[PDB]
Design a protein around this ligand. Structure first.
Ligand code: ZN
Length: 309
Protein backbone atom coordinates (compact mmCIF):
# COMPACT_ATOMS: atom_id res chain seq x y z
CA UNK A 1 0.00 0.00 0.00
CA UNK A 2 3.09 2.13 0.51
CA UNK A 3 4.29 4.50 -2.16
CA UNK A 4 8.00 4.16 -2.95
CA UNK A 5 9.85 7.48 -2.71
CA UNK A 6 13.43 8.61 -3.01
CA UNK A 7 15.16 10.42 -0.14
CA UNK A 8 17.99 12.48 -1.60
CA UNK A 9 20.27 13.58 1.28
CA UNK A 10 22.88 16.08 0.07
CA UNK A 11 25.98 17.57 1.67
CA UNK A 12 29.28 19.37 1.11
CA UNK A 13 31.24 16.15 1.36
CA UNK A 14 34.14 14.71 3.30
CA UNK A 15 37.21 12.70 2.36
CA UNK A 16 37.12 9.04 3.41
CA UNK A 17 40.79 8.78 4.24
CA UNK A 18 43.97 10.85 4.35
CA UNK A 19 44.68 9.92 0.74
CA UNK A 20 41.58 11.71 -0.63
CA UNK A 21 42.24 15.16 0.81
CA UNK A 22 44.28 16.38 -2.21
CA UNK A 23 41.51 15.79 -4.74
CA UNK A 24 38.90 16.90 -2.20
CA UNK A 25 40.21 20.42 -1.78
CA UNK A 26 41.29 20.69 -5.42
CA UNK A 27 37.59 20.29 -6.18
CA UNK A 28 36.79 22.84 -3.46
CA UNK A 29 39.63 25.05 -4.71
CA UNK A 30 38.11 24.73 -8.17
CA UNK A 31 40.84 22.78 -9.90
CA UNK A 32 43.65 24.40 -7.94
CA UNK A 33 45.63 21.57 -6.31
CA UNK A 34 46.94 22.70 -2.86
CA UNK A 35 50.66 23.40 -2.51
CA UNK A 36 52.70 20.62 -0.78
CA UNK A 37 52.93 22.55 2.52
CA UNK A 38 49.22 23.36 2.60
CA UNK A 39 48.59 19.72 1.83
CA UNK A 40 50.64 18.55 4.84
CA UNK A 41 48.96 21.18 6.89
CA UNK A 42 45.49 19.80 6.10
CA UNK A 43 46.50 16.24 6.95
CA UNK A 44 47.79 17.38 10.34
CA UNK A 45 44.55 19.16 11.17
CA UNK A 46 42.54 16.07 10.36
CA UNK A 47 45.08 14.08 12.34
CA UNK A 48 44.55 16.58 15.16
CA UNK A 49 40.76 16.42 15.31
CA UNK A 50 40.84 12.69 15.94
CA UNK A 51 41.17 11.57 12.35
CA UNK A 52 39.20 11.56 9.12
CA UNK A 53 37.52 8.12 9.02
CA UNK A 54 34.80 9.13 11.55
CA UNK A 55 33.84 12.24 9.52
CA UNK A 56 32.20 10.82 6.42
CA UNK A 57 30.65 8.08 8.53
CA UNK A 58 28.50 10.67 10.30
CA UNK A 59 26.81 11.57 7.02
CA UNK A 60 26.01 7.95 6.12
CA UNK A 61 24.59 7.59 9.63
CA UNK A 62 22.40 10.69 9.31
CA UNK A 63 21.11 9.51 5.93
CA UNK A 64 20.23 5.96 6.92
CA UNK A 65 18.96 7.05 10.33
CA UNK A 66 16.56 9.54 8.71
CA UNK A 67 15.44 6.90 6.21
CA UNK A 68 14.50 4.30 8.82
CA UNK A 69 12.88 6.84 11.12
CA UNK A 70 10.73 8.35 8.40
CA UNK A 71 9.72 4.80 7.51
CA UNK A 72 8.20 4.02 10.90
CA UNK A 73 6.58 7.32 11.96
CA UNK A 74 4.36 7.15 8.90
CA UNK A 75 2.96 4.23 6.89
CA UNK A 76 1.90 5.77 3.59
CA UNK A 77 5.36 6.11 2.07
CA UNK A 78 8.51 3.99 2.10
CA UNK A 79 11.76 5.95 1.73
CA UNK A 80 15.15 4.89 0.40
CA UNK A 81 18.06 7.23 1.17
CA UNK A 82 20.49 8.39 -1.54
CA UNK A 83 23.53 10.46 -0.59
CA UNK A 84 24.67 13.12 -3.00
CA UNK A 85 27.73 15.18 -2.14
CA UNK A 86 29.23 18.28 -3.72
CA UNK A 87 32.99 17.80 -3.49
CA UNK A 88 33.40 14.01 -3.47
CA UNK A 89 31.73 10.86 -4.73
CA UNK A 90 28.97 9.92 -4.62
CA UNK A 91 28.32 13.22 -6.37
CA UNK A 92 24.80 14.67 -6.53
CA UNK A 93 24.47 13.76 -10.20
CA UNK A 94 25.23 10.11 -9.48
CA UNK A 95 22.89 9.89 -6.50
CA UNK A 96 20.18 11.16 -8.83
CA UNK A 97 21.19 8.66 -11.53
CA UNK A 98 21.21 5.61 -9.27
CA UNK A 99 17.77 6.54 -7.99
CA UNK A 100 16.63 6.56 -11.63
CA UNK A 101 18.23 3.19 -12.29
CA UNK A 102 16.23 1.97 -9.26
CA UNK A 103 12.84 2.88 -10.66
CA UNK A 104 12.45 5.80 -8.27
CA UNK A 105 10.14 8.32 -9.97
CA UNK A 106 9.20 10.57 -7.06
CA UNK A 107 11.84 11.89 -4.65
CA UNK A 108 12.16 14.54 -1.97
CA UNK A 109 15.59 15.94 -1.20
CA UNK A 110 17.10 17.79 1.75
CA UNK A 111 20.56 19.32 2.19
CA UNK A 112 22.43 18.81 5.46
CA UNK A 113 22.79 22.49 6.19
CA UNK A 114 19.84 24.20 7.95
CA UNK A 115 20.17 27.55 6.13
CA UNK A 116 19.39 28.53 2.56
CA UNK A 117 21.88 30.22 0.30
CA UNK A 118 22.15 30.64 -3.47
CA UNK A 119 25.78 29.53 -3.39
CA UNK A 120 25.21 26.15 -1.74
CA UNK A 121 21.64 24.96 -1.22
CA UNK A 122 20.10 26.44 -4.39
CA UNK A 123 23.11 25.13 -6.29
CA UNK A 124 22.75 21.57 -4.88
CA UNK A 125 19.00 21.52 -5.59
CA UNK A 126 19.17 22.94 -9.09
CA UNK A 127 21.91 20.39 -9.89
CA UNK A 128 19.82 17.56 -8.46
CA UNK A 129 16.83 18.62 -10.57
CA UNK A 130 18.80 19.19 -13.78
CA UNK A 131 20.33 15.72 -13.70
CA UNK A 132 16.78 14.46 -13.30
CA UNK A 133 15.24 16.36 -16.24
CA UNK A 134 18.15 15.08 -18.31
CA UNK A 135 17.14 11.51 -17.46
CA UNK A 136 13.37 12.03 -17.30
CA UNK A 137 10.61 10.19 -15.51
CA UNK A 138 12.02 11.46 -12.22
CA UNK A 139 10.73 14.34 -10.05
CA UNK A 140 12.34 15.81 -6.95
CA UNK A 141 10.79 18.08 -4.31
CA UNK A 142 13.63 19.92 -2.59
CA UNK A 143 13.64 21.37 0.91
CA UNK A 144 15.37 24.77 0.95
CA UNK A 145 15.62 25.67 4.61
CA UNK A 146 14.66 24.03 7.88
CA UNK A 147 16.63 26.14 10.35
CA UNK A 148 13.27 27.42 11.64
CA UNK A 149 11.87 23.92 12.28
CA UNK A 150 10.75 23.94 15.98
CA UNK A 151 12.35 20.59 16.70
CA UNK A 152 15.68 21.71 15.29
CA UNK A 153 15.68 24.81 17.49
CA UNK A 154 14.61 22.94 20.62
CA UNK A 155 17.66 20.77 20.02
CA UNK A 156 20.04 23.71 20.23
CA UNK A 157 18.10 25.51 22.93
CA UNK A 158 18.55 22.58 25.31
CA UNK A 159 22.25 22.03 24.59
CA UNK A 160 22.59 25.73 25.45
CA UNK A 161 20.48 25.54 28.63
CA UNK A 162 22.63 22.55 29.60
CA UNK A 163 25.90 24.39 28.94
CA UNK A 164 24.95 27.54 30.85
CA UNK A 165 23.44 25.35 33.54
CA UNK A 166 26.84 23.75 34.13
CA UNK A 167 28.62 27.09 34.30
CA UNK A 168 30.07 28.41 37.57
CA UNK A 169 27.71 31.12 38.87
CA UNK A 170 30.62 33.35 38.23
CA UNK A 171 30.62 32.53 34.52
CA UNK A 172 26.92 32.16 33.83
CA UNK A 173 26.57 35.90 34.39
CA UNK A 174 29.50 37.01 32.26
CA UNK A 175 29.23 34.69 29.27
CA UNK A 176 28.60 35.49 25.59
CA UNK A 177 26.69 33.28 23.15
CA UNK A 178 28.10 33.17 19.63
CA UNK A 179 25.89 31.55 16.95
CA UNK A 180 27.63 30.90 13.62
CA UNK A 181 27.57 29.42 10.12
CA UNK A 182 30.00 28.86 7.22
CA UNK A 183 31.05 32.20 5.82
CA UNK A 184 30.18 32.89 2.19
CA UNK A 185 31.30 35.53 -0.34
CA UNK A 186 29.67 38.90 0.27
CA UNK A 187 28.62 39.12 -3.37
CA UNK A 188 25.76 36.73 -2.57
CA UNK A 189 24.11 39.98 -1.45
CA UNK A 190 23.35 41.22 -4.96
CA UNK A 191 21.02 38.26 -5.42
CA UNK A 192 19.13 38.90 -2.19
CA UNK A 193 20.45 35.70 -0.64
CA UNK A 194 18.64 35.29 2.73
CA UNK A 195 21.57 33.30 4.14
CA UNK A 196 22.74 36.08 6.49
CA UNK A 197 19.24 36.94 7.66
CA UNK A 198 18.36 33.34 8.36
CA UNK A 199 21.48 32.80 10.46
CA UNK A 200 20.67 35.93 12.47
CA UNK A 201 17.21 34.38 12.84
CA UNK A 202 18.64 31.07 14.14
CA UNK A 203 20.51 33.09 16.74
CA UNK A 204 17.41 34.98 17.83
CA UNK A 205 15.41 31.75 18.16
CA UNK A 206 17.99 29.69 20.06
CA UNK A 207 18.99 32.57 22.34
CA UNK A 208 15.32 33.34 22.98
CA UNK A 209 14.25 29.78 23.67
CA UNK A 210 17.25 29.39 25.94
CA UNK A 211 16.73 32.62 27.87
CA UNK A 212 20.13 34.07 26.91
CA UNK A 213 19.98 37.88 26.58
CA UNK A 214 23.58 38.42 25.44
CA UNK A 215 24.70 36.90 22.13
CA UNK A 216 26.20 37.79 18.77
CA UNK A 217 26.26 36.39 15.28
CA UNK A 218 29.44 35.31 13.54
CA UNK A 219 30.87 33.49 10.53
CA UNK A 220 33.72 31.09 9.96
CA UNK A 221 35.84 28.88 7.74
CA UNK A 222 35.81 31.48 4.98
CA UNK A 223 37.77 30.62 1.88
CA UNK A 224 40.53 32.59 0.24
CA UNK A 225 39.72 34.85 -2.69
CA UNK A 226 40.10 38.53 -3.60
CA UNK A 227 36.43 39.36 -3.07
CA UNK A 228 35.26 39.94 0.53
CA UNK A 229 33.34 37.29 2.48
CA UNK A 230 30.80 37.57 5.31
CA UNK A 231 32.15 38.91 8.57
CA UNK A 232 33.05 39.30 11.30
CA UNK A 233 34.91 35.97 11.46
CA UNK A 234 34.40 34.12 14.78
CA UNK A 235 38.00 34.70 15.90
CA UNK A 236 37.92 38.50 15.64
CA UNK A 237 34.38 38.79 16.98
CA UNK A 238 35.33 36.77 20.05
CA UNK A 239 38.38 38.85 20.82
CA UNK A 240 36.41 42.01 19.97
CA UNK A 241 33.48 41.25 22.31
CA UNK A 242 36.01 40.49 25.01
CA UNK A 243 38.04 43.67 24.77
CA UNK A 244 34.78 45.63 24.78
CA UNK A 245 32.93 43.84 27.61
CA UNK A 246 35.39 41.34 29.02
CA UNK A 247 33.22 38.23 29.05
CA UNK A 248 34.44 35.32 31.12
CA UNK A 249 32.95 32.67 28.87
CA UNK A 250 32.03 32.17 25.23
CA UNK A 251 29.60 29.45 24.08
CA UNK A 252 30.01 28.65 20.38
CA UNK A 253 26.93 27.21 18.67
CA UNK A 254 27.94 26.53 15.03
CA UNK A 255 24.27 26.06 14.06
CA UNK A 256 25.08 26.22 10.35
CA UNK A 257 26.76 22.83 10.78
CA UNK A 258 25.09 19.52 11.65
CA UNK A 259 28.02 17.33 12.61
CA UNK A 260 31.60 16.88 13.76
CA UNK A 261 33.16 18.41 10.62
CA UNK A 262 36.67 19.88 10.40
CA UNK A 263 34.91 23.24 10.39
CA UNK A 264 33.78 22.58 13.98
CA UNK A 265 36.47 20.41 15.58
CA UNK A 266 39.35 22.64 14.48
CA UNK A 267 37.90 26.02 13.54
CA UNK A 268 35.86 26.17 16.74
CA UNK A 269 37.45 23.77 19.26
CA UNK A 270 40.99 24.80 18.32
CA UNK A 271 41.11 28.17 16.54
CA UNK A 272 38.47 29.72 18.76
CA UNK A 273 39.80 27.98 21.86
CA UNK A 274 43.14 29.62 21.02
CA UNK A 275 41.39 32.99 21.41
CA UNK A 276 39.45 32.15 24.60
CA UNK A 277 42.64 30.76 26.15
CA UNK A 278 44.69 33.80 25.09
CA UNK A 279 42.19 36.22 26.66
CA UNK A 280 41.64 33.99 29.68
CA UNK A 281 38.02 33.00 28.98
CA UNK A 282 36.39 29.57 29.21
CA UNK A 283 35.58 27.81 25.95
CA UNK A 284 32.26 25.98 25.61
CA UNK A 285 30.84 24.22 22.56
CA UNK A 286 27.73 21.93 22.85
CA UNK A 287 27.51 18.59 21.07
CA UNK A 288 26.74 18.85 17.36
CA UNK A 289 23.53 17.09 16.25
CA UNK A 290 25.29 14.38 14.29
CA UNK A 291 23.03 11.33 14.18
CA UNK A 292 21.29 11.77 17.51
CA UNK A 293 17.55 10.77 17.65
CA UNK A 294 16.42 14.26 18.59
CA UNK A 295 18.02 15.57 15.40
CA UNK A 296 16.87 12.81 13.05
CA UNK A 297 13.34 13.28 14.40
CA UNK A 298 13.45 17.00 13.61
CA UNK A 299 14.85 16.16 10.17
CA UNK A 300 12.00 13.76 9.65
CA UNK A 301 9.32 16.37 10.41
CA UNK A 302 11.07 18.71 8.02
CA UNK A 303 10.71 16.12 5.25
CA UNK A 304 7.14 15.18 6.06
CA UNK A 305 5.86 18.75 6.31
CA UNK A 306 7.44 19.39 2.92
CA UNK A 307 5.25 16.61 1.51
CA UNK A 308 2.13 17.87 3.26
CA UNK A 309 2.16 14.91 5.62
ZN1 ZN B 1 35.05 25.68 3.80
Amino acid sequence: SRKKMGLLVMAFGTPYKEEDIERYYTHIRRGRKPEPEMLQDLKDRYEAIGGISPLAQITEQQAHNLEQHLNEIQDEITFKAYIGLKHIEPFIEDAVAEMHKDGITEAVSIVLAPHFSTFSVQSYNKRAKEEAEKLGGLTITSVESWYDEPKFVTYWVDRVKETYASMPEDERENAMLIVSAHSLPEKIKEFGDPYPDQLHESAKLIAEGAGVSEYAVGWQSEGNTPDPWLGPDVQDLTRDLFEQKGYQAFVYVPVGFVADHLEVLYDNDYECKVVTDDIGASYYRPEMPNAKPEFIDALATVVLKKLGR
